[PDB]
Design an enzyme around this catalytic site. Sequence first.
Site, PDB file in Angstrom:
ATOM      1  N   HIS A 198       0.799  -1.220   0.000  1.00 56.18           N
ATOM      2  CA  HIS A 198       0.000   0.000   0.000  1.00 56.18           C
ATOM      3  C   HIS A 198       0.834   1.273   0.000  1.00 56.18           C
ATOM      4  O   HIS A 198       0.330   2.319  -0.426  1.00 56.18           O
ATOM      5  CB  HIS A 198      -0.927   0.041   1.225  1.00 56.18           C
ATOM      6  CG  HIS A 198      -1.652  -1.246   1.491  1.00 56.18           C
ATOM      7  ND1 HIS A 198      -2.817  -1.596   0.842  1.00 56.18           N
ATOM      8  CD2 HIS A 198      -1.382  -2.262   2.345  1.00 56.18           C
ATOM      9  CE1 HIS A 198      -3.229  -2.774   1.276  1.00 56.18           C
ATOM     10  NE2 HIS A 198      -2.373  -3.201   2.186  1.00 56.18           N
ATOM     11  N   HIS A 223       4.285  10.874   6.200  1.00 54.51           N
ATOM     12  CA  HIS A 223       3.847  10.579   7.560  1.00 54.51           C
ATOM     13  C   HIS A 223       5.005   9.972   8.338  1.00 54.51           C
ATOM     14  O   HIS A 223       5.475   8.880   7.999  1.00 54.51           O
ATOM     15  CB  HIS A 223       2.643   9.636   7.548  1.00 54.51           C
ATOM     16  CG  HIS A 223       1.398  10.287   7.026  1.00 54.51           C
ATOM     17  ND1 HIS A 223       0.335   9.576   6.513  1.00 54.51           N
ATOM     18  CD2 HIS A 223       1.064  11.596   6.920  1.00 54.51           C
ATOM     19  CE1 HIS A 223      -0.614  10.418   6.138  1.00 54.51           C
ATOM     20  NE2 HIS A 223      -0.197  11.650   6.376  1.00 54.51           N
ATOM     21  N   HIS A 280       2.071   9.035   0.946  1.00 58.06           N
ATOM     22  CA  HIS A 280       0.900   8.897   0.099  1.00 58.06           C
ATOM     23  C   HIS A 280       1.064   9.841  -1.082  1.00 58.06           C
ATOM     24  O   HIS A 280       1.521  10.974  -0.906  1.00 58.06           O
ATOM     25  CB  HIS A 280      -0.368   9.237   0.867  1.00 58.06           C
ATOM     26  CG  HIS A 280      -0.518   8.456   2.134  1.00 58.06           C
ATOM     27  ND1 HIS A 280      -1.220   7.270   2.192  1.00 58.06           N
ATOM     28  CD2 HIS A 280      -0.017   8.664   3.375  1.00 58.06           C
ATOM     29  CE1 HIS A 280      -1.179   6.802   3.429  1.00 58.06           C
ATOM     30  NE2 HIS A 280      -0.439   7.620   4.162  1.00 58.06           N
ATOM     31  N   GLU A 315      -3.339  13.410   1.750  1.00 58.76           N
ATOM     32  CA  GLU A 315      -4.516  12.968   2.482  1.00 58.76           C
ATOM     33  C   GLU A 315      -5.181  14.154   3.168  1.00 58.76           C
ATOM     34  O   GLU A 315      -6.360  14.434   2.934  1.00 58.76           O
ATOM     35  CB  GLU A 315      -4.127  11.878   3.484  1.00 58.76           C
ATOM     36  CG  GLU A 315      -3.436  10.690   2.816  1.00 58.76           C
ATOM     37  CD  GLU A 315      -3.570   9.407   3.606  1.00 58.76           C
ATOM     38  OE1 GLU A 315      -3.095   9.360   4.762  1.00 58.76           O
ATOM     39  OE2 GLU A 315      -4.153   8.440   3.067  1.00 58.76           O
ATOM     40  N   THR A 360      -4.920   6.539   8.930  1.00 57.71           N
ATOM     41  CA  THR A 360      -5.628   6.719   7.665  1.00 57.71           C
ATOM     42  C   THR A 360      -5.661   5.460   6.817  1.00 57.71           C
ATOM     43  O   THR A 360      -6.159   5.516   5.691  1.00 57.71           O
ATOM     44  CB  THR A 360      -5.013   7.836   6.827  1.00 57.71           C
ATOM     45  OG1 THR A 360      -3.737   7.397   6.341  1.00 57.71           O
ATOM     46  CG2 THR A 360      -4.882   9.129   7.650  1.00 57.71           C
ATOM     47  N   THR A 361      -5.105   4.353   7.303  1.00 58.39           N
ATOM     48  CA  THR A 361      -5.300   3.046   6.703  1.00 58.39           C
ATOM     49  C   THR A 361      -5.908   2.108   7.732  1.00 58.39           C
ATOM     50  O   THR A 361      -5.759   2.313   8.944  1.00 58.39           O
ATOM     51  CB  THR A 361      -3.983   2.438   6.194  1.00 58.39           C
ATOM     52  OG1 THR A 361      -3.009   2.454   7.248  1.00 58.39           O
ATOM     53  CG2 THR A 361      -3.456   3.201   4.982  1.00 58.39           C
ATOM     54  N   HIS A 408       6.410   6.871   5.863  1.00 59.96           N
ATOM     55  CA  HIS A 408       5.896   6.404   4.585  1.00 59.96           C
ATOM     56  C   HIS A 408       5.262   7.602   3.892  1.00 59.96           C
ATOM     57  O   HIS A 408       5.182   8.700   4.457  1.00 59.96           O
ATOM     58  CB  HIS A 408       4.876   5.270   4.770  1.00 59.96           C
ATOM     59  CG  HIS A 408       3.662   5.694   5.538  1.00 59.96           C
ATOM     60  ND1 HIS A 408       3.576   5.586   6.911  1.00 59.96           N
ATOM     61  CD2 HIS A 408       2.509   6.279   5.134  1.00 59.96           C
ATOM     62  CE1 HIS A 408       2.411   6.062   7.316  1.00 59.96           C
ATOM     63  NE2 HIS A 408       1.747   6.494   6.259  1.00 59.96           N
TER      64      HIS A 408
HETATM   65  N1  LIG Z   1      -1.308   6.580   7.183  1.00 62.50           N
HETATM   66  S1  LIG Z   1      -1.045   6.742   8.865  1.00 62.50           S
HETATM   67  O1  LIG Z   1      -2.198   7.366   9.540  1.00 62.50           O
HETATM   68  O2  LIG Z   1       0.091   7.610   9.216  1.00 62.50           O
HETATM   69  C1  LIG Z   1      -0.821   5.120   9.636  1.00 62.50           C
HETATM   70  C2  LIG Z   1      -1.872   4.073   9.334  1.00 62.50           C
HETATM   71  C3  LIG Z   1      -1.760   2.886   9.878  1.00 62.50           C
HETATM   72  C4  LIG Z   1      -0.573   2.580  10.791  1.00 62.50           C
HETATM   73  C5  LIG Z   1      -0.506   1.216  11.455  1.00 62.50           C
HETATM   74  C6  LIG Z   1      -0.944   0.073  10.794  1.00 62.50           C
HETATM   75  N2  LIG Z   1      -0.915  -1.119  11.432  1.00 62.50           N
HETATM   76  C7  LIG Z   1      -0.493  -1.208  12.704  1.00 62.50           C
HETATM   77  C8  LIG Z   1      -0.470  -2.448  13.338  1.00 62.50           C
HETATM   78  C9  LIG Z   1      -0.040  -2.561  14.652  1.00 62.50           C
HETATM   79  C10 LIG Z   1       0.372  -1.433  15.333  1.00 62.50           C
HETATM   80  C11 LIG Z   1       0.361  -0.198  14.698  1.00 62.50           C
HETATM   81  C12 LIG Z   1      -0.078  -0.078  13.382  1.00 62.50           C
HETATM   82  C13 LIG Z   1      -0.096   1.135  12.758  1.00 62.50           C
HETATM   83  C14 LIG Z   1       0.324   3.496  11.071  1.00 62.50           C
HETATM   84  C15 LIG Z   1       0.199   4.874  10.434  1.00 62.50           C
HETATM   85 ZN   LIG Z   2       0.093   7.556   6.172  1.00 63.72          ZN
END
Ligand SMILES: NS(=O)(=O)c1ccc(-c2cnc3ccccc3c2)cc1
Ligand SMILES: [Zn+2]
EC number: 4.2.1.1
Length: 257
Positions: free
Chosen positions: A61, A116, A93, A103, A195-196, A91
Amino acid sequence: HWGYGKHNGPEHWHKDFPIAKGERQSPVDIDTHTAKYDPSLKPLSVSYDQATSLRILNNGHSFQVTFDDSQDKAVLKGGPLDGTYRLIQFHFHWGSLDGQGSEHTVDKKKYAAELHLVHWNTKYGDVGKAVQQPDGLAVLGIFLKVGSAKPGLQKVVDVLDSIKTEGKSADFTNFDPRGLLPESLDYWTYPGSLTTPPLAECVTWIVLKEPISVSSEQVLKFRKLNFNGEGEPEELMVDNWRPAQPLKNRQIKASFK
Ligand SMILES: NS(=O)(=O)c1ccc(-c2cnc3ccccc3c2)cc1
Ligand SMILES: [Zn+2]
């Protein structure tokens, strides 16, 4: 599973992750005339001088650079935060075109990409516990616009060839994330979510006012990555962004007038 296509994208996520329709979802539009200057907000403290990067990975992703978060090496403090947040990964987007990809939006304006930097609150011991808490994570969000190249991003761009498809990873030690920051640390801040998926409502968002500029060649190399794994039909990794969500009962605060 979930993705960014017509049949598994953001409009579908709520079926597996019903918090997608929750009360503090991210991203949001930042309406600059409605955000309130909060003179009690402290300056951000970004302490990245001991940052220890480990790997860069295409996770199907996005691509992310991971860091050693077993000690207080690269931490975010201050601003709206209490306590200490360790950098775990960053990472991006990005879009298929320069006019979309971020985003968060600013007065409905979309940037070409968004960075991010993901941190977690050390009082919860590990990131898995932190994601279950309303103040468990702090994400520093930085807008990218297309213009001059960002020298501190080039080492990332250089290695993307080696992680073209989902599941590929490479060594990415000795990367200095301070080279991705703009000059100013002025910011907007609000309570939100990942956001995922799982879209957990665990994030204090800190979004920097000043974008960084990246070159068209640099963002082009983002767009040559693949959503798919090796040997599968090629689907370019572009437009891996979630659109703005309803602000609901939240106020965005600004660190600057
Ligand atoms: N796109 S964002 O908001 O910065 C973002 C979205 C999802 C994560 C994420 C995903 N899976 C995880 C699984 C276990 C612990 C933390 C996690 C964070 C971490 C950051
Ligand atoms: Zn992100």
